[PDB]
């Protein structure tokens, strides 16, 4: 829905799990529109700062991931439509990753970059 | 036809 789309260009941040790009206001007010149940950054700014990225390159307006080879290359086919980031700089702390793994969610890095 | 205007009917909008 439109609630996922960012409202302005200022303070755009990409999530560290699903690469979802949103404003800091939308992370504060809605959390993650894909996996907030697994992260729970709604109602906490520090959780957003720990769980989102200040450095990203590339943006995809994923409209129909069910029939998108873009989502096949980026591994976002099973997620909802929205604004995703291609490459994300950042990493969750070990505590959040271990908590996700105990719930059966292994943390795959969205840093798909060619570092030199 | 095209009407004519006297110079007094030209408001001072060109200066504003």
């Amino acid at each position: 829905a439109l609630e996922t789309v960012p409202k302005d260009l200022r303070h755009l941040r990409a999530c560290l799990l699903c690469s979802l790009v949103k404003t800091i206001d939308q992370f504060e007010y809605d959390g993650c529109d894909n996996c907030d149940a697994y992260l729970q950054m709604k109602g906490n700014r520090e959780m957003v700062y720990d769980c989102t990225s200040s450095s990203f390159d590339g943006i995809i307006a994923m409209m129909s991931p069910e029939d998108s080879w873009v989502s096949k290359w980026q591994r976002v086919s099973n997620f909802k439509p929205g604004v995703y980031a291609v490459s994300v700089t950042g990493r969750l702390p070990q505590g959040i990753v271990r908590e996700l793994k105990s719930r059966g969610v292994a943390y795959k890095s969205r840093d798909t970059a060619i570092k030199t | 036809g095209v009407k004519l205007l006297d110079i007094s009917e030209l408001d001072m909008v060109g200066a504003g």
Binding site: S54, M62, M63, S68, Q74, V86 | -
Partner: protein, 471 residues
């Protein structure tokens, strides 16, 4: 699968176009005019155009209709080739940063204090300002007295200062800026910036040996070069085949008695000849001087050009001339008539040299410039030098053997031995001769005659000055 088609877009407004087209898709997904395209891609670093996913070009044209931003791609579209579809999404990648926007674009800035709020960081900078004197620029130190004197928006707390748009400074600007407004990776400032706040160099033609391996002790001339793993192509002695060596296996070895230049270090720029090749202490002597210069093997290159090692006449003041004896970054080392070497700024005046000037030596022999003259009296008695500049009673002598002031010194000339007419533009009146009666203006004047443009007729003619009488 569907194919991607390129659509030209307004520069810098691709993401807004994608947002608008997604909103259009949602606003017409249930109507009788559905958008049959599948997706829209507006890459971050690809500026000027976007991609649309569809099975047909007609779908693209009918979908982008009503979008002004894509009108330059409306008539025709180009499909992305099938083999390059991966490359659309292929993405690559107390410290110092560089501010992006403002007048401090791409200026080195030292990260003084990092705010934990993750909104801005305090940065130390050098001001590129005119101190409110020109506006109604290069880096220079922050002068507090000047901006206090000039007034304007300025607030003083000793060394602490606020000025000109809430710019904060102390002793050097100290202002907060967003990390998104700077670059926090890949600055790598130089030594000069540190004062303000391995390497491989193989060249074609240079000779290198082999320090290890089965091909040890093979000296050959470099042909090519690369970054790290050079895989070099050296022409060895008594070998017509070309072998392979990386950068790490070679060393800049040179036989004695050959031209050598220094690539870097305290001895950079000086040329010369190496004498003895020890293990790592390579000793050489310059073309200028005869001092021992010890360099590493890597600090040598084979270059056959002559050493550079200039000598312009400048005016220290209207009473004393000066001869430049060394050229520096921001000053001139100038040797004057008195024999006193001084250091002066770039902004002395260039005097008109008189190369035909005549001077007398100590034996009443006329001497001119470029003449080899011996100094028999004075502080420099016994030396012999070539004249380069002249004064009323001084002469500047160059000598290559003398290593002082580039060989330039000065001695008094008597201690050496050789080894506009006022009538111009004046209204005049012909008081004598056939042209009597008339009035004219003097164009040119001489000792005897003078040209007059005649006012009366459309000509100019010359007349004796005796024939003229001024108005």
């Amino acid at each position: 699968d569907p194919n991607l088609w390129t659509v030209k877009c307004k520069i810098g407004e691709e993401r807004a176009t994608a947002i608008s087209l997604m909103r259009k898709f949602i606003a017409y997904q249930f109507t009788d005019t559905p958008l049959q395209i599948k997706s829209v891609v507006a890459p971050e670093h690809v500026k000027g155009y976007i991609y649309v996913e569809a099975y047909k070009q007609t779908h693209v044209k009918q979908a982008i209709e009503g979008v002004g931003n894509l009108r330059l791609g409306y008539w025709n579209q180009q499909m992305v080739p099938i083999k390059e579809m991966t490359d659309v999404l292929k993405v690559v990648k107390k410290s110092w940063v560089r501010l992006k926007r403002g007048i401090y674009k791409d200026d080195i800035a030292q990260v003084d204090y990092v705010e934990p709020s993750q909104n801005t960081i305090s940065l130390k900078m050098i001001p590129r300002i005119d101190y409110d004197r020109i506006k109604a620029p290069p880096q220079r130190l922050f002068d507090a007295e000047k901006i206090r004197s000039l007034g304007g928006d300025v607030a003083s707390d000793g060394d602490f200062l606020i000025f000109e748009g809430n710019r904060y400074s102390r002793k050097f600007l100290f202002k907060s800026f967003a990390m998104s407004a700077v670059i926090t990776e890949g600055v790598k400032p130089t030594l000069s910036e540190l004062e303000k706040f391995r390497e491989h160099n193989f060249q074609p033609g240079d000779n290198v040996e082999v320090c290890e391996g089965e091909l040890i002790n093979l000296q050959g001339k470099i042909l090519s070069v690369d970054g790290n793993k050079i895989t070099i192509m050296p022409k060895h002695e008594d070998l017509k085949d070309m072998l392979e060596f990386p950068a790490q296996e070679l060393r800049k070895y040179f036989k004695m008695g050959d031209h050598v230049k220094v690539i870097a270090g305290r001895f950079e720029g000086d040329t010369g000849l190496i004498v003895r090749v020890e293990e790592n202490f390579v000793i050489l002597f310059s073309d200028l001087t005869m001092h021992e210069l010890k360099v590493l093997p890597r600090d040598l290159q084979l270059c056959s050009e002559t050493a550079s090692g200039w000598g312009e006449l400048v005016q220290l003041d209207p009473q004393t001339v000066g001869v430049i004896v060394r050229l520096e970054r921001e000053t001139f080392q100038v040797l004057n008539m008195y024999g006193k070497v001084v250091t002066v700024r770039h902004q002395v005046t260039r005097k008109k040299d008189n190369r035909f000037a005549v001077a007398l030596d100590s034996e009443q022999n006329n001497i001119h410039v470029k003449d080899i003259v011996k100094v028999i009296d004075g502080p420099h008695s016994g030396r012999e030098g070539e004249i380069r500049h002249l004064f009323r009673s001084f002469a500047f002598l160059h000598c290559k053997k003398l290593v002082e002031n580039g060989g330039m010194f000065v001695c008094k000339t008597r201690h050496l031995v050789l080894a506009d007419n006022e009538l111009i533009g004046q209204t005049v009146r012909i008081s004598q001769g056939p042209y009597k009666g008339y009035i004219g203006v003097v164009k040119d004047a001489t000792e005897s005659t003078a040209r007059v443009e005649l006012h009366s007729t459309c000509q100019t003619i010359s007349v004796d000055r005796q024939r003229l009488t001024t108005v």
